[PDB]
Structure 1
């Protein structure tokens, strides 16, 4: 079955674009990435950087995760990201999202060998 690392790539990586281009980015992406198949996932963040740059965060600033875990890491530099948040008109199976572009540091939880990102914790 799908690995935590692969799931991270599917849910959060979008290296083929530098930023969200229209207000429909989240609607398309949430659907295409299969994140709205069983229910409308409330929030999600896509990262517009090379996979290599994001995997490299696992060797950057170690910080505690929101939940208290200590296997989180914060990127030294800001990254281009798109925040997807469910709209008031979102109704399964027709999930709807507001697209917000931003540039911030990201915090991911890392696991395994090779030590890679398996969870997107927050953007600061």
Structure 2
């Protein structure tokens, strides 16, 4: 397989060790800065719930998407870098991100 960032991180983070996940996004910002999004702009989640929040600013993100010829155990990904607003669903106390709803 290829040694691109996506192939490597998806494996290291236990996302493709036992299957090939179609898509995943990695955020390159401090953990605390991402957690801070839970008190930023309140927006509706795709499912209709209102516990989602959109970051005020764009953040550095890497999008990982399976190629058309990807097949377990040899998962293969296309790596795309971008700067976009993230939308996260938050829950609990402390009020932190538990799901990524999207990226604008």
Once superposed, which parts of structure 1, at least 4 consecutive aligned residues long, lie more than 4 Å away?
Answer: none
Distance 1:63 1:23, change over 3 A: farther
Report the more deviating stretch, 34-43 or 102-111.
Answer: 34-43
Report the more deviating stretch, 91-100 or 23-32.
Answer: 23-32
Q: Which runs of 5+ in 1 are unaligned?
A: 1-20
Q: For 1:48 and 1:39, how far apart are their aligned partners in 2?
A: 24
Structure 1 length-normalised TM? 0.80
3-state DSSP class of the match of 2:87?
strand
More helix by share: 1
Q: For 1:22 and 1:39, how far apart are their aligned partners in 2?
A: 16
Quick check: 2:2–2:76 contact (8 Å CA) kept in 1? no
CA RMSD of aligned residues (A): 2.2
Structure 2 length-normalised TM? 0.95
3-state DSSP class of the match of 1:54?
helix
The corresponding residue for 2:46 is 66
- Kindly tell me the number of residue pairs found equivalent between the two proteins: 104
Quick check: 2:35–2:96 contact (8 Å CA) kept in 1? yes
Deviation, 1:23, is 7.7
Deviation, 1:89, is 1.6
Task: Give the greater-gyration-radius structure (CA).
Answer: 2
3-state DSSP class of the match of 1:27?
helix
